[PDB]
């Protein structure tokens, strides 16, 4: 997969993934891979927006060759920033985030791994994954960039989690 004749190349190839699982629990598949801006729109403009997905569902957009699981070599020493959103906000947030990621707005060298939008029962969750959780200059820069590129509600909690780090929870 290479950019075509007069397309606009990207800094990396990326791969779209989709998953549907159950809470409390191979269920993750590749949708397609792109090498240019025009090719990205060719996938993305024909995809269901995360705000119209049903179930316990996620879209993942990752650098080609990185699997959206933490055990992956590029992910095992990393972490993610997490933003929890009310229903109605995820689709616009996901678009602004993937356009920022693709256009190289983060400026953190090779640290970015990919992004996930997670549809849950009563909230959506957007995350961005990076290589090195202990790299405070990188995670600080990622946090600030998210604030520059997303229109978030005031009061919005952002939270970093390293991957290695009453009744049962039934709905989510």
């Amino acid at each position: 997969v290479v950019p075509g004749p007069a397309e606009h190349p990207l800094q990396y190839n990326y791969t779209f993934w989709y998953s549907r699982r159950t809470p409390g629990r191979q269920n993750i598949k590749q949708i397609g891979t792109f090498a240019s801006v025009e090719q990205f729109w060719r996938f993305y403009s024909h995809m269901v927006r995360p705000g119209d997905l049903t179930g316990h569902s996620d879209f993942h957009l990752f650098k080609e060759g990185i699997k959206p699981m933490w055990e992956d070599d590029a992910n095992k020493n990393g972490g993610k920033w997490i933003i929890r959103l009310r229903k109605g906000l995820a689709s616009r947030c996901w678009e602004n985030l993937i356009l920022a990621m693709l256009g190289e707005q983060f400026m953190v060298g090779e640290e970015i791994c990919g992004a996930v939008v997670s549809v849950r029962f009563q909230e959506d969750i957007i995350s961005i994954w990076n290589k090195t959780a202990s790299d405070q200059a990188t995670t600080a820069r990622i946090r600030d960039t998210l604030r520059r590129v997303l229109n978030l509600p005031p009061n919005t909690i952002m939270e970093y989690k390293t991957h290695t780090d009453g009744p049962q929870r039934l709905l989510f």
Binding site: Q11, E38, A100, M107
Partner: peptide, 16 residues
Amino acid sequence: RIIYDRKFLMECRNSP
């Protein structure tokens, strides 16, 4: 590094 502004990226959406 290959850097794209959001405006530019959006404008490409109308190019086949």
